[PDB]
Amino acid sequence: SALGKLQDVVNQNAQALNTLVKQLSSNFGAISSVLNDILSRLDPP
Amino acid sequence: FASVYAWNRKRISNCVADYSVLYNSASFSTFKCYGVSPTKLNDLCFTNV
């Protein structure tokens, strides 16, 4: 009133989940990152 | 119309424009859409055309 070996696990796991969430906003070479804006202004082919 | 070397440029403003009266008019010899297929135009929303 020390615990860094326990805070390291919490931090590493949050840092991985954040990267997974944030990769949902890359185009990977498409026109939009959001699927609804490809569906709305393009036709199936 | 206007020449090819000095084309015109109209900046369409707010106005419920029906892209359907265009698409189905059958009087057009060429109607290509690039960013967006034609049938999904009459439901979208733009700010400056």
Curated annotation (Swiss-Prot), chain A:
Gene giving rise to this polypeptide: S
Stretches assigned to coiled coil: 7-45
Effect of S40A: In strain: Alpha/B.1.1.7
Organism ancestry: Viruses, Riboviria, Orthornavirae, Pisuviricota, Pisoniviricetes
Organism: Severe acute respiratory syndrome coronavirus 2
Outcome of swapping D8N: In strain: Delta/B.1.617.2, Mu/B.1.621
Protein name: Spike protein S2'
Effect of mutating N27K: In strain: Omicron/BA.1, Omicron/BA.2, Omicron/BA.2.12.1, Omicron/BA.2.75, Omicron/BA.4, Omicron/BA.5, Omicron/BQ.1.1, Omicron/XBB.1.5, Omicron/EG.5.1
Annotated phenotype, changing Q12H: In strain: Omicron/BA.1, Omicron/BA.2, Omicron/BA.2.12.1, Omicron/BA.2.75, Omicron/BA.4, Omicron/BA.5, Omicron/BQ.1.1, Omicron/XBB.1.5, Omicron/EG.5.1
Summary of the function given for this chain in its UniProt record: Subunit of the fusion protein that is processed upon entry into the host cell. Mediates fusion of the virion and cellular membranes by functioning as a class I viral fusion protein. Contains a viral fusion peptide that is unmasked after S2 cleavage. This cleavage can occur at the cell membrane by host TMPRSS2 or during endocytosis by host CSTL. In either case, this triggers an extensive and irreversible conformational change that leads to fusion of the viral envelope with the cellular cytoplasmic membrane, releasing viral genomic RNA into the host cell cytoplasm.
Portion of the full-length sequence here: 939 to 987 of 1273
